[model samples]
Target chain A: KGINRVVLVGTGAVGCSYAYCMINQAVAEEFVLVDVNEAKAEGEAMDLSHAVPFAPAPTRVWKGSYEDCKDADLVVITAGLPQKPGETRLDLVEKNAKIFKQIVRSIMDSGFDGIFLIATNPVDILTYVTWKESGLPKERVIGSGTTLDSARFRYMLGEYFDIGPHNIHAYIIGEHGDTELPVWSHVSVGIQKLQTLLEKDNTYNQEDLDKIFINVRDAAYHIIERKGATYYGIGMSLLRVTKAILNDENSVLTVSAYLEGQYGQKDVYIGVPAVLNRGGVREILEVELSEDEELKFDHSVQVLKETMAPVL
Target chain B: KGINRVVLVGTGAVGCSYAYCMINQAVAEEFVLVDVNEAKAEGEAMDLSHAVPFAPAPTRVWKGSYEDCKDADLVVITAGLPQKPGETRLDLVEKNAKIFKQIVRSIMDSGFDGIFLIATNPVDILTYVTWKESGLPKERVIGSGTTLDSARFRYMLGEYFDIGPHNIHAYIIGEHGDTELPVWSHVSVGIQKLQTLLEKDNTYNQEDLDKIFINVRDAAYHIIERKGATYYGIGMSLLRVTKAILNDENSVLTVSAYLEGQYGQKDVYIGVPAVLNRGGVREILEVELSEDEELKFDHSVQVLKETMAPVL
Candidate 1:
């Protein structure tokens, strides 16, 4: 007689948005906030609580310590310092690495034998690190990874093609941050390939793809610059992942998962098309990347290995 | 430039749950729904849609004529006869009466636009009806009211309460069928009174403020026994209402609107609450009924009187 429970370990703007999205999606019975800033946790809990009356369920949202993770079905770790502007993912490795250690240690200590949904930036490396630190299986720790980038790409493509986002099958691979790559070769709208769509429509193409990266990469920065943070999109992204897991929707999403001989990569974590469900990362699809795409993906992996070495 | 569109006409079980609680929580952008089954127009809309979402900037989700209301944020008509154990909301209303024409006529003819959030029972009802009768609002008109009831309250409540359906918030509120009320008042949480939790805790009421009668009523029954209805609970409720409204927040709960004088005696409609944002029915609240609530509501004054008189 247990309902699903999710613990979010960060109550930042992104975390709050995730909570809001979860509420909208009705993904969890309870969402526990474990932000380092207790006030922020309380604030988020309060904000979401007031909105609870409006939510579909009497979702108990409260702040707690890592110990609360015990028996949690999913522990979404959104904690860790965000990558600063102009700073490489490698730069924050030391700081976020330490934070990640503390978080994993606390969660594991609580006997939290749940799937870990990582939303931290430099997420690819951090996901691998969480796998290592928590002694959890590779399948257990999932970095939000290319999910958001994929969504942004889909939105941009949908707009250009004049289609619904749901109808667009999109993906971005490799490191979740700057080094990530969009599998442009495999992009499509349902069954229609992107190249084919462009050929027929003549209104969209490589340039649109290029501008999309601008919005995708700088989206957080843009929001940060104006409002000091970006949360809605990422929040929506988290909820999407939550839905996949909670409902066992078997959704094919590009998220950060440890690469175990898939795509010819090993040991390191990267974003790839993976089927996510209640079992988590049920299967990783080895989409065929073009020669150039493969090389770029390999390069991204190399960068992640080097950047993550110091932190680990 | 564009706004969220949503519409629900019947104010019975399904429609009320969709409109009422959602509006109370400021959940949607435009919350509009009508019910030919009951007929109360303005008062029902006024009482439900304007409960919360708008104070500073208005978000509208209200009752309107089928034609004038089309091209709404999203139109959902819960109009029909409602079903009995062996019958459906559509079957009870009589084939011609159950036909969505009375409303869809002006709606499609007026070129009134927007998605149709369909909630007529034997739901497959006006599903084909709305699709056939309405020339405009096509893909937008979806028969998903029972989807909410089935997915949210019916499925989740038992687990949330750690008991069987009888001990749970066993409900589907508004209208998906006839004789549909899934009584929440009869719910027993371990050993506590649900309605007087605050009172029992010595926090709110201090007298014999029992909520049993208020929670269980016949209107809801018409929805159940007939295949159940809706409760403004879960991720779906918020998402549906909010998606249509496009406002960040407005409309607390999704309930039946367009009720006559607010005491279930509303002439034309018979649902609960509705909240709307810029699109319509931005905010509404049903004065908690203590046997009787707002007696001269908008719906009661307008369509209810006309419809209840036995002459269209």
Candidate 2:
């Protein structure tokens, strides 16, 4: 009776990777795929069905309709169109917002009352919009936000400092990337701050560290330049968040959560470190940011506000 | 100095999935991809580099040449061509044998004294030839044989019995797929044999049980028809074996092992139950197959010997 079922919509590259990650880690017990293309979704289901045997846990994978979401514990949406050539950012946002509205409505109409995890582009806006449409608590709707960017930030920083990324305590707050701000004050390789380490170690100057921050911010563009699109990173990032919820780990992650006076911001879905559990966002952790860091975070939130204004 | 380095060859669909598996699970500390098309492998490395951030561990990903294998703790070969539409099975097998010979020689020439793992087509033949060419200990050279096939068998069996695959103790041994035999004698859920359970339950009888075995044997055909190839299963299977070595877990797995007067076979690499650890294979488990199973295994090994005879 307590088995968790996750309904994943949009069987694109990103969705496939996310499902693979779940199966590989045995994070979910039952998985359902809801995509518009019956054949593509069917193909994805078959591919993953084969992977279940080698996974750490047991899972039943199938391609199901929205009606199947009635008993799902969670619904993850990665279904949306990308920006076309010469299209305005608003044009893509409005189209995706329309997509989200219908996607959320179908799941809700099926008597679904599960937590919603949004991974589509313009994630912060889509997550906020989904919350408003679904009539669910704001904490139940989360975006796979700077969770990955912060990971990339730690990854790049770990390589630069010759340390393991797992030990690199860091956070990339504000938005997913473009306007994201790295909280350098809180950066550390354990308890010792990177700033302190930088002063003691002359191997790299502060200028070199600045480049790592820039790379973490523009990581997607560089990856897209090499491959067609970036999915493997975000795929696992979603799992990290999903596992937190299913396991009730109460782990702190940089997720896009609705703000109600957290970080001195209100009525907007922005990236910040938040504690996640079975009940969704248990608490939003507020890291003490520098004056400069706070300025960048406010601007990042402003960009989301302006970009989402047209669709709302 | 103790960090494990893994070199993967042939950056095709299978290779890509394997690398993604390594990064997703943090199976290796340093990963290198080598391919004929430098751009292809470089793109793969960059794709996985972005994924390393969300992984449980940190890794250094790069595109390297054969010389990079010098310090590699393990070299996994998934590089070989498939059978053309009009070609005979033997035609394809001989071509891959040539491919393995050269691939193994290059790594050996580069002062690589690590373990060799062969996952290419005609895996049994190629694995046998790799051991001959690389001059490695029989225990140090293994093939990704029935590992995935047994996994698929357990998966299908678990679903039929409404039990988790992790609790399903089963083995598919001999040559991979076509000639592989499911040792129903050893099948059980925990310590209780499935045969005993079937005798008590009437929901499905022996006829239904036979279908599950049929599905496992033809699993590759089913997955290939749906997705054009089977990689995700084998991808993770390789990781399972790799982790056993890296962590010295000494876990039991179904792998292709060199036979020397065991199971009444010799000088061939065929799938069987074996104990795996840091020293490659610690011991081969004899399932004590029934008369019928032993006959099937002998035939399976015979088919491999004849198919490989023309090339060697």
Candidate 3:
């Protein structure tokens, strides 16, 4: 049997937390944490190695250099400047773009031929940069873009209606930021469409649902204000998507993949409901959007296109 | 159908790490953090709540009071002065006993009727103290004793033999500390006994295996010296035991349970191989030990009995 090995870049709150999730879940057989900050990565690895004893799967975790990525199955990048409380995710784009490019170059030099899972901020833009910088296929370089956004959206609806989030099928599409739109037309609660429910039940009008979506959009700020960053949610989000890729599950997730003429967007990476397997995104599922939803998505993509132009 | 609610009564490193593991696993549908440090508990709950959206369970997590324990399914205590690097777990026994009593009074005052899972140090004694203080049945009060120790033992043996830890069944019983002893006679790899393998294979001798056991015994100290505490390993131990109790797995694990006549002991609590289910420890499994192994176990329990006598 082949062993699964993962090299994680960065030892920030998000990266460390995600590593802890992977350790507890027994996701990786060989895991290495790489960063420019040696002491930080070293201590975190020592802390994480002790955890392996308790997990049924005994993982070999250590502080590693870029050479460890030579034969890695996946290299996760959460390496970047933290998103500031007063600034939007886009504000750190220029700084994090340089950081991601530098880190990806080191990994590429190691002859890494695996998937690049991006969790850094301004994720859509950085994911695109990672793709072009590493010269890898567009599908292999995926960003955890609207994955967490959709999770929050599903949680919000599930809480309000007293339904499980897992039973609800919905996606948060586009920038994964202020302009992200919820595809309510395709929302289904265990085989029953939300459109059918709204018409059948007068208690759930459009205004209340819109408010729920707004809460989902701003959940990061609320969490960041309380804690310093949004680590745990994004950490689990990264872990979930990694499982889909490694296990060849062909799972449908709302992640950022290259958009080539789908949703009338070309030559850019953005969040959409896509099927994922070992070889990466198999197909980008395109749902019919309402006129208002289409207008919102169009604006979202326009902002990404303009923001991504200078970097490209 | 009843929803499982867990009340955690600490906000320290161990407690927080265990709470994070539970959140990522979605073990509790209604989970609350009950600690004197409201600010710490509140912030951690906020951080943990955001993670629930990514987890499929959609848990309701918040900072709560003892009153909220009125309908809990489990109340886990990781509250105590932490063990010092230079001090043994017994050093914190007196201080933690007082801490545990006060917390248990508040929980018992809430009309709570559930299991008490102890992760605090001087664990065996504290488990005994909790059982007597809350007037709960011996089966309902359990400690995460040598569960972690056994995990380390299995991991060490698996690494030395290049076998998966899940396929290796071994138990470290007695104290959770330095006195814990491995049941070498009962060690098995799948269907074959480790002793059988040792008889057939010349590469492994008793001296080498003894060295491996010593490393497992000192793992806590090594991890503590490096990271200041053993949170991640112990955190996973607590979660594994919690799952056995919550899901009625009837799984056998090495945990600190009451010794009401098992192994010729009475009115004392010590770590032993026991079967766990929803009602807690179903039975304490007693295996035949070699003459030398029995002597080692006698000394181990003797240490526990004398240490627990004063606390009782």
Candidate 4:
């Protein structure tokens, strides 16, 4: 019945948002943040811990460590190199890969057999490598993948169209990188296609969908440019992943999952719709990608593969 | 940035879930649970909605009316008849559909421009009917759908695998009824496939998957049989949905959304993978359904259509 037990491996802005999201979301029983910057983690924890008095359940948010990973139901790894102003998720992979190895070793050494929800840079590659290096099964390793990217896409579209983001059925599929593709063909508002909705409502038709896509695709760059890093959204995304796992929701999420014959790709990790449970990526849900979308997805995988060639 | 509001039109089991979930999840900045059962609503509200020192935010959880709907960013409708044992979410559609119509009309009449997140019996039908009857933009109407059922499925699986529920990634698609199908093919522990993991880790494989599925399908009956009704899990599901909306995190979740052409159905409502945000049903994700799963989905839709025809 104690359904909320979450551990964040890093406490940057993303980790802080994730912790607060847990507090605001009320899905966590106890939250512990582990960071190289323990002071930041502690400070964030103190703020969140005090705010628990205003929360629904008896929640405890605090700063912790690799040792804390021992009993954690889920360990979210947001630890690694921060993205530079103009860097991509792939660009940070080589640097973050070594960090991922060290962190995974420490976590595994601490007997952390729980699911490893990865949000480190080069997420897809980092996630695949986490499984390989840790000797953990594939199910235990997952990445936030394109979830935040997809959300960004939807938020932009919803704002532009003056509609609810939740009602817009769509995704930004592939790597959470320059090659990420928004599946516009599958976009719908309730039962109506987005194209149809806009066709009937000309007020927003003048808005360029590509502009929104570009903004969505490059939101991290904008945020990082403003603040030298982007964490709240990605951190919030990690918390969302944690909530689903801790709740044993077995809910479908567009997370990074290992490929096995889906999309004609094999033995690689990329962003796609995958089943998320406490264990991690349970199974991958392959979607029918459009020709252009498929080209983008293939490019993302190739780019990620090339990025991983030096590290993995 | 201040995206927080919750509304409950009833105080029965499901409605209580809506209230208690709001508390448990801390998803509302202000919460109102209104019911004809004034005392019941007040009691439930008092039990959870009071200004307590436990939530992360100060929430006004009380018994109120159409006035409360004013200025709310999101309104949840969990009002309807109580379902007896063996009664599906759609079985009570006729009566609940009528109630939903009135509820939606009143909410809209109150100048409520927010999204309507509904949790009533015959949820799929109610969700569809609520959308049709409300005349509000399609994005504003949402149903709790199989969110509860999805939770139930995960609960059992987690127990079997000896992992937290959040580790499992799956969904109970289509009707939240006897016809509901667990997307077993999508099951994962984290990034690992459940079946493959089960095969390798025979310790838990002794538990039959079919029995687990049946137990999930029958969990509500068991809970209802034990206590007069079930609320905790459903309430928790509400909290999950609330956090996604209130935080504007654009989290991906399996929730009730109106369907169009994606699942080979139209003008009907059902549970699906959705990207939820402050605007509600931010986006509906179209997953790759297997051939057999597709057939089962169609059958479930057929059942929902039949159950809703009389009400419509």
Best by TM-score: 2
Better of 1 and 3 by DockQ: 3
Worst-scoring 10-residue span by lDDT in model 1 chain B: B49-58
Question: What is the DockQ for all candidates, taken in turn?
Answer: 0.03, 0.48, 0.39, 0.07
Against the true structure, what is each candidate's TM-score? 0.58, 0.92, 0.88, 0.59
Per DockQ, the best of the predicted structures is 2
The number of clashing residue pairs in each candidate reads: 138, 0, 0, 54
Sorting all predicted structures by TM-score, with the top scorer first, yields: 2, 3, 4, 1
- Give per-residue CA lDDT, model 1, range B1-312, as digits (tens): 265555666665345544544543444456665555333544445333222211112335456655546466556666666444686432444563445666677666657666555555444334545655665423244444332442334233434434433234333333443323333444344456566554364543413222322322322443233223323232344345445455534533333333334444532333344454434444334544322223323323343233223223
Summarize candidate 2's per-residue lDDT along B1-312 as a digit string, tens digits: 788999999987788787888887787889999998787787778767877767777778989999999999999999999888899988888788888888888999999988888888788888899988888899999899988888888877777877877888887899885888889888887678877877885685767867887888887777667657777788888888898888899888888899887888888888888899988988888778899999999999998888888666
Stronger candidate by TM-score (1 vs 3): 3
- What's the DockQ of model 4? 0.07
Score each candidate by Cα lDDT.
0.60, 0.85, 0.83, 0.74
Residues A21-43, model 2: lDDT tens digits: 88888788899998988767877
Question: Which number leads on lDDT?
Answer: 2
Reference-based TM-score, model 2: 0.92
lDDT of 4 at B254: 72
Root-mean-square deviation (CA) per prediction = 14.8, 2.7, 3.4, 9.1
Tens digit per residue, CA lDDT, model 3, B1-312: 388999999977788788888887788788899888776687677677666766646678889999998999999998888766587545677778888889999999999999999988888889988998999999999999899888777777877777877778888888878788888898887677887888884686667889988988887667666445567777788889989999999999899988877777777788998999999999999889778778888888888887765576
TM-score winner, 1 or 4: 4
DockQ measured for candidate 3: 0.39
